[PDB]
Amino acid sequence: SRMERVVRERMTTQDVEAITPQTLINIRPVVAAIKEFFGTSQLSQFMDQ
Amino acid sequence: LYRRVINRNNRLKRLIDLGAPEIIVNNEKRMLQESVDALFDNGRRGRP
Amino acid sequence: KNWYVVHTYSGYENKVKANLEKRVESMGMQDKIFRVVVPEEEETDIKNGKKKVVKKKVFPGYVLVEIVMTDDSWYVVRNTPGVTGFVGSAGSGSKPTPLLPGEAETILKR
Amino acid sequence: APVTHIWYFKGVPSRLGYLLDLAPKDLEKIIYFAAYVITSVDEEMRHNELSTLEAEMAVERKAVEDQRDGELEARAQKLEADLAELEAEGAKADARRKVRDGGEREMRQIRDRAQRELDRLEDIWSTFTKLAPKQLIVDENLYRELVDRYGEYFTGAMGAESIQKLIENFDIDAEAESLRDVIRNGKGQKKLRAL
RNA sequence: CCGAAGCUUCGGCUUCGGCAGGAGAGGUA
DNA sequence: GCGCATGCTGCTCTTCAAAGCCACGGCGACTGCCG
DNA sequence: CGGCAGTCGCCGTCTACCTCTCCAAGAGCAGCATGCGC
């Protein structure tokens, strides 16, 4: 959803005929969410061995 | 919280000693008041 | 038609001006907004002859913007990637207060 | 610029509001730049200028009436002329009935505009006759008008600099004996508020 | 305050070197 | 050979937006609401 | 005016000890550095 908001907001400030799917998409929010869940979270717990 | 207070105070001083319109000065004064309020007690009014 | 004020973050006045001038037409409203003016002046300084003219914005953080008032103009000039709000909102911000003729003229006359 | 300590205004209760006799919402509005307040009012100069101000106000009253009747005479001129020249030559006067309703609503358009102006003047005058200190006033328009026409005699602003003035111009003894007088002979809930 | 090194009259003197806060999860009595 | 213009890298800010998620008891002001 | 009852915010909710992990990142502004042109 964060990436979708970014692409919607940036689709109206660039010039047409130079817009490609690779220039509208930002990966940083998705990787940030993944690495924030698998680290500092209350449900992904240190395993006891 | 000290850095925020100092930054707002410096911006307010420079804008006052420049001949700014009343709306902008009022906005800066409101923002300085909020910063000091957050310094003394954070979360009492509004959001933390 | 009045002159209003907008509040950007810090250093993003010229990027808010650019994005707004682009979204004037790209979006679809060429008769609502009219003129965007980022107040600017000069600064006397030289380095043994070579000049610099520091970009001392006479109002760091604000961008006056001539605009009419509807319910789609507010939307476009409030979601621009950079603006923070409509400085002037004195009371639930239900109708931003416009800049006063005099002050607007003496700011533009610089 | 002066600021206000949070402990003495956002508490339970509000000690600043108890000292100044102001509701906490009113204090929050004044402090955070959302409404005005009247610090002082020179009543001697609002006494030895009364009938003179009333005469100038009657001058503007008459001038607004003259404007109204001027353009009412010229609108009825245009009307009368065009309507009597083309009073539905041949057919039924459905065009002159459409412009009958439209001309009656044009007369009542300029009439409600002159009524609106009469109301503006009436309220301006009333407020300038009922202006006591520590009275909150909203709506920038009205304030600006009062400060343009009757600029002097009345002083006030918003922010903590305007609360410093209220605190500075405060008399502890008079209010203290007033509260003791209220507690001495009183009942209901005003006694509880005084306590 | 501690360590290293010099003078040391044995009281000490001099040089250099060196830090320690928050949030979350699980457990024992 | 000298003067013009544009690009490597330290280096220093910057943070209004807005949808999100939803015990229990005691106490005291308060505030719109009904009469 | 005068009562009035819901309501909304703020206060509080045992002690001592052990082990582990994680704690701002993207945007922008100079200070020269060098290639190229006449």
UniProtKB/Swiss-Prot annotation, chain A:
Changing L43P: In strain: vr2; rifampicin-resistant. The chain holds residues 394 to 442 of 1178 of the full protein. This is DNA-directed RNA polymerase subunit beta. It comes from the Bacteria. The RNAP catalytic core consists of 2 alpha, 1 beta, 1 beta' and 1 omega subunit. When a sigma factor is associated with the core the holoenzyme is formed, which can initiate transcription. Interacts with CarD, TRCF (Mfd) and RbpA. DNA-dependent RNA polymerase catalyzes the transcription of DNA into RNA using the four ribonucleoside triphosphates as substrates. Belongs to the RNA polymerase beta chain family.
Swiss-Prot record, chain C:
The keyword Transcription regulation applies. One of its GO terms (cellular component) is cytosol. Signal peptide: none annotated. One of its GO terms (biological process) is DNA-templated transcription termination. The keyword Transcription regulation applies. Participates in transcription elongation, termination and antitermination. Stimulates RNA polymerase pausing at U107 and U144 in the trp leader. NusG-stimulated pausing is sequence specific. Does not affect trp leader termination. This is Transcription termination/antitermination protein NusG. The chain holds residues 3 to 112 of 177 of the full protein.
Swiss-Prot record, chain D:
It comes from the Bacteria. Induction: 6-fold repressed by starvation. Coiled coil: none annotated. The RNAP catalytic core consists of 2 alpha, 1 beta, 1 beta' and 1 omega subunit. When a sigma factor is associated with the core the holoenzyme is formed, which can initiate transcription. DNA-dependent RNA polymerase catalyzes the transcription of DNA into RNA using the four ribonucleoside triphosphates as substrates. Belongs to the RNA polymerase beta' chain family. This is DNA-directed RNA polymerase subunit beta'. It comes from Mycobacterium tuberculosis (strain ATCC 25618 / H37Rv). The gene is rpoC.
